[PDB]
Structures are given as C-alpha cells and as structure tokens.
Design an enzyme around this catalytic site. Structure first.
Site, PDB file in Angstrom:
ATOM      1  N   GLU A 155     -15.972 -11.299 -14.689  1.00 38.10           N
ATOM      2  CA  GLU A 155     -15.908 -12.714 -14.355  1.00 38.10           C
ATOM      3  C   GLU A 155     -14.588 -13.057 -13.623  1.00 38.10           C
ATOM      4  O   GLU A 155     -13.872 -13.991 -13.974  1.00 38.10           O
ATOM      5  CB  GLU A 155     -16.188 -13.567 -15.597  1.00 38.10           C
ATOM      6  CG  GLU A 155     -17.658 -13.499 -15.953  1.00 38.10           C
ATOM      7  CD  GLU A 155     -18.095 -14.325 -17.155  1.00 38.10           C
ATOM      8  OE1 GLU A 155     -17.256 -15.017 -17.782  1.00 38.10           O
ATOM      9  OE2 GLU A 155     -19.331 -14.251 -17.462  1.00 38.10           O
ATOM     10  N   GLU A 189     -24.568  -8.847 -17.042  1.00 41.07           N
ATOM     11  CA  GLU A 189     -24.401  -9.348 -18.420  1.00 41.07           C
ATOM     12  C   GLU A 189     -25.217 -10.597 -18.487  1.00 41.07           C
ATOM     13  O   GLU A 189     -24.993 -11.483 -17.706  1.00 41.07           O
ATOM     14  CB  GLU A 189     -22.931  -9.680 -18.728  1.00 41.07           C
ATOM     15  CG  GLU A 189     -22.675 -10.182 -20.142  1.00 41.07           C
ATOM     16  CD  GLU A 189     -21.259 -10.710 -20.341  1.00 41.07           C
ATOM     17  OE1 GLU A 189     -20.311  -9.947 -20.049  1.00 41.07           O
ATOM     18  OE2 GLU A 189     -21.101 -11.863 -20.813  1.00 41.07           O
TER      19      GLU A 189
END
Ligand SMILES: O=C(O)[C@@H]1[C@@H](O)[C@H](O)[C@@H](O)c2nccn21
Lengths: 74, 381
Positions: free
Chosen positions: B64, B182
C-alpha cells in the site's frame, strides 16, 4: 415468477486463470504475535492448508514496511 | 518497527512447503537511503540466508505504497518505487535461482489518487514484474452492516474497481497478468460477526466469479488464519464457511472461464458464473461444465439449463447455513449435511446430490450452489 432461464457461452474459453487462482495471505502483523511459532506448527492448520493446494501464500500486509531482519535473533 | 528471526523464516517456509504452497514474501520498502532511495541491505541479508538455505520463495516489495505518507510520513512516487523494483530485480537475478518471481506494487484499490501512482510505477517498473498486484475490500468493518453483505449493489461496485485497474494496465503493460494481491469483505480486520459467517460467502464467491470472468488470474484471500474476522480458519483452528466454500471451489471449478447470464436481466440478485469443470477431479471428464450461482432473493428460484444442455445429469452442491443463527452462522451444510473435519489430519468427502436429468436447478433464498453438468461435451473444455 420464480423460473429463470440461463444463457451460456461455451464456444471458446474467455479467460485462463492459474490453477492457484484461489490463494491466501498471512498478515505480516502475525509476526508481532508471541505465538507465531506455535500456530504455524499446528498439524491441523497444515492439513487445512493442504486442502487448498495448489495456491500462493502471500506473507505481507501493512506490517511489511516495519519488519527488520536481524541475523542475531532466534 | 519490529525485528524478525531466521527462526521465523524457517517456520514460515516449512509451513508453506509442508502445505504444498508457493510462498511469496513481501519486503520492507520504507528502509531508505538518505536521498529517499531504497536501501537494499536488510533484504540482501535476508536473500542470502534464504539462498543459504535453498528455499524456493517469491518476492514483493512494499505494501500500500499509496499510503506511506499517512502511514509513515514518507512520500514515494511510483517512478521512485519503479527504480527500487528494478534494484530488487537486479539482486534476485544475481542470486541462486534467479528464475524466481517478483510481483507488485500492492497499491490499494482504484482511487483517483492511487491510479496515478500505479501508472507511474508501471511506466518505470512495469518491466521487471511477473504480475500486477492490487488490493480490494467492500466495506469498512467497523461500520459494515448485515444488509450490505446481502446487497447486490455492494457486490457490483467491485466491477468498476476492476475496469479502472485494467484501464491503467492497458495504458502501460498490456499482456501483463493482473492479480488481486490482498483482498476481502471489510477492512479494519473485518466486520465482527459478519466477515466470519455464511453471509461472508456471498461476497467471496462473487469476488471469485467476477475476477475470473474479468481476467484476474489469481485472487489472494485476506486471510487464511488470524486475528481478523475475515479468516478462513478461526482462533481454535476451526474451518469457517468461507473455508468450506473455498475447498469446494478448488475441487470443482476449472481454469478455463466461460460465461452464463440470466434471460430475465433486471434484478441484480441472481448472479451466475460458468467455467470448464476442473478436470483433475476424479469424478469428471473433460468437456463437463461447472456452474456456480448466488441467490439474493428472499424466495427460491429455479434455473433452467439451456438447449442443448436441458436434458443432462447434474450434480448439485448446495450450501446453506447450519442453524440456529442462519446467515450469521459459523457452520454450513452441503446438500443438508453439516461439514466438519473427520479429525485433525483428515477432511471429509464433499458429496454431491446426483440430480435428475432434465430437472430445473433449485436455488433457495440467500444461498449459493455449484452444479456440474455431467456429459456436457463442450470442445473448449
Ligand atoms: O484493515 C484490514 O482489514 C487490512 C489490514 O489488516 C492489512 O494489513 C492492510 O494491508 C489492509 N489494506 C486494506 C485492508 N487491510
């Protein structure tokens, strides 16, 4: 009314996914647990994981950017 | 920050290898050279040990990265991350296998900010990656409700996330393979008493449906085991309904993706998907088809198989909750039989119901089922 008819497309395959299509992750934060050693050693858990082979296991997560490898730790 | 041990790596690996799993390991992207360049020294150490140990492992770098600034007050543009990925790529090629894989950049879903970062990253670093990774969640777990899990509008938002990703990837690296890196129902460790239920299965099975139909080659579920309510296996190592759904999927659904659709075509509540039957399953041949379906209506729906399939024999694998908690239940039955482990080393049979040949396909309210069309003789399959 409750009867619905379905259309199908069977001429050629539209996409080809990996035999590992359905895969899983272990969150990096699970390394901040003191019980990491115990939990992954569980034979029951390993049995469940084998029923999901073949697949990718992704170890990462928010905590990926906060794990430091230390060679003098065990 | 926290430190981890060679001891940790060995266990994590052994668990992957003994479970018949290809492990992918994410590396720390926030270790940085004074000028904001990625210092490679910690990974280098870790790479050498793993080289030392003969572990076949695959790698990611960062997580991220669109969020480093809120998450660590360090901003890394994609280009920079792209250079950093090139460096990681140098290192793996120099080392023992070097025909080993690298994926990235694990940016969160299509956000108007996140697309910029991924685009800039695929320009610079698109060259070294073997697949493109992004994340997706439907809800915020803290505020997610039970109707959301049953709301077809919630399900469908997923499609524009997907269209937006391929929009970026086609602008830079077409033919590059895309992975859900994810992904789950609800962020912030899951929605309590929802993300771990039968109700979570409407989201998960639709996510696999949509992804296969839209070109996603791999979907990685957050998580297999853990703290979050979105685990496939609970605190006491018990399989949750998503685990049983996920097993059934692997055994029944093939790699070759097809299409089914409803002739009604208005309500958003009856979702259908079609693949070649997973040939590896000892009960079937090639040419058979595997149909999976979700019913978000508050009454039973009966599906008719089309010509020339209207008269074939069908194995039905219907899943419904084990009461008394119904959709919030953490137990699930297949064709009316509760699904449990036989013991800690042994999974039970998943038994079908051979349906009548020519019978329409009963799908009850808030249920999901698989149907394998036996003797389908399709040529693509
Ligand atoms: O918050 C979560 O449920 C997980 C969280 O637990 C993960 O570590 C992080 O990578 C993430 N991104 C989106 C959701 N998540």
């Amino acid at each position: 009314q409750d009867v619905v008819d379905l259309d199908f497309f069977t001429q050629e395959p539209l996409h080809l996914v990996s035999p590992s299509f359905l895969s899983v992750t272990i969150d990096a934060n699970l390394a901040t647990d003191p019980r990491f050693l115990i939990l992954l050693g569980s034979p029951k858990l390993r049995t469940l994981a084998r029923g999901l082979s073949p697949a990718y296991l992704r170890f990462g997560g928010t905590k990926t950017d906060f794990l430091i490898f230390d060679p003098k730790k065990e | 920050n926290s430190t981890y041990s060679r001891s940790s790596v060995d266990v994590l690996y052994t668990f992957a290898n003994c479970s018949g799993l290809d492990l992918i390991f994410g590396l720390n992207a926030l270790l940085r050279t004074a000028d904001l360049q990625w210092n490679s020294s910690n990974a280098q150490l870790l790479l050498d040990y793993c080289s030392s140990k003969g572990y076949n492992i695959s790698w990611e770098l960062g997580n991220e990265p669109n969020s480093f600034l809120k998450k660590a007050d360090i901003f890394i543009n994609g280009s920079q991350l792209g250079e950093d990925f090139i460096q990681l790529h140098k290192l793996l090629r120099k080392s023992t296998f070097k025909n080993a894989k690298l994926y990235g950049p694990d940016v969160g879903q299509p956000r108007r900010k996140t697309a910029k970062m991924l685009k800039s990253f695929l320009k610079a670093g698109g060259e070294v990656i073997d697949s493109v990774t992004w994340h997706h969640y439907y809800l915020n777990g803290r505020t997610a409700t039970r109707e959301d899990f049953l709301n077809p509008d919630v399900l469908d938002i997923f499609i524009s996330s997907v269209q937006k990703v391929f929009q970026v990837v086609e602008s830079t690296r077409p033919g590059k393979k895309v992975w859900l890196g994810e992904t789950s129902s609800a962020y912030g460790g899951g929605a309590p008493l929802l993300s771990d239920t039968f109700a979570a299965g409407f989201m998960w099975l639709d996510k696999l449906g949509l992804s296969a139909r839209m070109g996603i080659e791999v979907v990685m579920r957050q998580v297999f085991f853990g703290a979050g309510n979105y685990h496939l296996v609970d605190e006491n190592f018990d399989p949750l309904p998503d685990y049983w759904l996920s097993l059934l999927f692997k055994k029944l659904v093939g790699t070759k993706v097809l299409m089914a659709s409803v002739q009604g075509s208005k309500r958003r509540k009856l979702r259908v998907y079609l693949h070649c039957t997973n040939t590896d399953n000892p009960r079937y041949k090639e040419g058979d088809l595997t149909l999976y379906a979700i019913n978000l209506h508050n009454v039973t729906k009966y599906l008719r198989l089309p010509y020339p399939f209207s008269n074939k024999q069908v194995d039905k694998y219907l899943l419904r909750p084990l009461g008394p908690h119904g959709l919030l239940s953490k137990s699930v039955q297949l064709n009316g039989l509760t699904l449990k482990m036989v013991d800690d080393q042994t999974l039970p049979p998943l038994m079908e119901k051979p349906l009548r040949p020519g019978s329409s396909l009963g799908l009850p309210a808030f249920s999901y089922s698989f149907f394998v069309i036996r003797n389908a003789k399709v040529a693509a399959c």
